[PDB]
Design a protein around this ligand. Structure first.
Ligand SMILES: */C=C/C1=C(C)C(=O)N/C1=C\C1=NC(=C\c2[nH]c(/C=C3/NC(=O)C(C=C)=C3C)c(C)c2CCC(=O)O)/C(CCC(=O)O)=C1C
Length: 491
């Protein structure tokens, strides 16, 4: 079934227990405390040297040099806003300050992650004109480009990419900003398997993820197995959680040495990431984490506003076309001209590269459409049996093997009937998605992991396929198809 944390290979890593890592990155320390009463019962092995403490494991938090207990207590107030929560405390014998991050896993007590504090700095001069740029963005393109720039300006990382996941989970490098001279990944695709489902749920549970040095030596928890459960400690909510050797090897092959990844979550779904990559090990100021979180919420809000604006654009193009015909039939005794271009493109309310109208044995086409004999082959298949108000597919060959030769122009077809005579259709097209990008290639083993190979593994799945048809896509064909039909019954 599911391989334990350090132990997967390329064939079973989907199910690797990355949330049960059993270890942390060396630049912090992790205590596990029981409740109530707050006895340290599990600790990262580096805890004593890291925190300047004699012993750790088994000693009550009250008895640890320096105010940590006192600093967590106000956040266990039933009525407080509570966990996850950050605190600043002093710990240890040569006493020093730490930023603590406390949360409660569903099982195992209280987890407290510690890192060395620096002096307090105020980053709020950053989020305000950034907030204005985000809320001001005119399009998804513009917003993601500005978000790559913005994240590069406030993080200083060598490369920032904003990925965007599609219906199936696959990633597109949708925006990129990098220091001149690096190679570009802008426009690359990767298969959804490059990011395991559990990694995806982890990006929803915490919104900032940090790797300071791709070369670190994991520091194990002791005892490892939680004494309260006899099982591995749920580490979903741990900022210091080690990172899978699989992905570390991926970064090593890419040249990359550090990583600051921020989650974009839209309507409760992981929508993409803002990935910051550095070609050097890289520490960050604690106050940079809240900045990322605030920024990613603004972005996610804007994306919602854009998708929603796009929505009513469609619903407009529609009820603003019942009229492109109403009259444009008064003089010029036929409606078709309204269908085809006129810059009210029948092609974009569905994001298609081609459209055809088959009506009374007359076939007209804009964009990239199969041969007119080929439209007829499709019309012949639509008439083979009774259909829904809309019929669609994003893998025409394979769904309909005899139509395989149409993969090029028409892996994706959506058809809507326009009467009952039938043989009469409004038909939209999309090419095999391979033709929406090109570049790629190669083989398999952790040493072979790379963007190049990922772009190739992507072309391989996806093979007999177009961009999938969305709900909105189908709603549009639905309602467009309908109002044409309504108005053909007219005359
Ligand atoms: C079977 C397991 C894995 C295979 C195979 C794999 O490629 N990755 C697997 C596990 C993990 N991936 C994690 C994060 C991650 N992986 C990549 C993959 C990309 N593919 C691309 O072509 C490129 C470059 C353009 C990349 C970066 C991406 C994009 C991500 C998101 C993180 C990032 O951008 O740095 C992952 C989680 C790591 C963690 O612990 O935070 C696991 C596990």
């Amino acid at each position: 079934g599911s391989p334990a944390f350090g132990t997967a290979d390329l064939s079973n890593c989907e199910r690797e227990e990355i949330h049960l890592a059993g270890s942390i990155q060396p630049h912090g320390a992790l205590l596990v405390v029981s409740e109530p009463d707050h006895r340290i019962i599990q600790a990262s092995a580096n805890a004593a040297e890291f925190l300047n403490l004699g012993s750790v494991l088994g000693v009550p938090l009250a008895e640890i040099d320096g105010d940590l207990l006192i600093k967590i207590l106000p956040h266990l107030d039933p009525t407080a806003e509570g966990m996850p929560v950050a605190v600043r405390c002093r710990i240890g014998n040569p006493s020093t300050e730490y930023d603590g991050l406390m949360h409660r896993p569903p099982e195992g007590g209280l987890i407290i992650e510690l890192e060395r504090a620096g002096p307090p700095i105020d980053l709020s001069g950053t989020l305000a004109p950034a907030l204005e740029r985000i809320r001001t963005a005119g399009s998804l393109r513009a917003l993601c480009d500005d978000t790559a720039l913005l994240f590069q300006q406030c993080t200083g990382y060598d490369r920032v990419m904003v990925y965007r996941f599609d219906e199936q989970g696959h990633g597109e490098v949708f925006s990129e900003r990098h220091v001149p001279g690096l190679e570009s990944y802008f426009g690359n695709r990767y298969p959804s398997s490059d990011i395991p489902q559990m990694a995806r749920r982890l990006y929803e549970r915490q919104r900032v993820r940090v790797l300071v040095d791709v070369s670190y030596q994991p520091v194990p928890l002791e005892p490892r197995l939680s004494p309260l459960t006899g099982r591995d400690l749920d580490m979903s909510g741990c900022f210091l959680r080690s990172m899978s050797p699989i992905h570390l090897q991926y970064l090593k092959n890419m040249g990359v040495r550090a990583t600051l990844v921020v989650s974009l979550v839209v309507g409760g779904k992981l929508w993409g990431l803002v990935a910051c990559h550095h070609y050097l090990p890289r520490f960050i100021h604690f106050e940079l984490r809240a900045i990322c979180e605030l920024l990613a919420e603004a972005i996610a809000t804007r994306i919602t506003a854009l998708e929603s604006f796009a929505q009513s654009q469609s619903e407009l193009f529609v009820q603003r076309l019942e009229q492109r015909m109403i009259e444009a039939i008064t003089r010029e005794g036929d409606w078709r001209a309204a269908i085809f271009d006129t810059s009210q493109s029948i092609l974009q309310p569905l994001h298609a590269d081609g459209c055809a109208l088959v009506y009374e044995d007359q076939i007209r086409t804009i964009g990239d459409v199969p041969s007119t004999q080929d439209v007829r082959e499709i019309a012949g298949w639509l008439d083979r049996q009774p259909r829904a108000a809309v019929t669609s597919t994003a893998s025409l060959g394979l769904d309909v093997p005899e139509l395989a030769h149409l993969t090029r122009m028409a892996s994706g077809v959506v058809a809507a009937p326009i009467s009952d005579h039938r043989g009469e259709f409004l038909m939209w097209f999309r090419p095999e998605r391979v033709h929406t990008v090109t570049w790629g290639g190669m083989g398999d083993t952790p040493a072979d992991l790379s963007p190049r190979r990922s772009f190739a593994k992507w072309h391989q799945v996806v093979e007999g396929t177009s961009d999938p048809w969305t709900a909105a896509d189908l709603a549009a064909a639905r309602t467009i198809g309908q109002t044409v039909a309504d108005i053909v019954l007219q005359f």
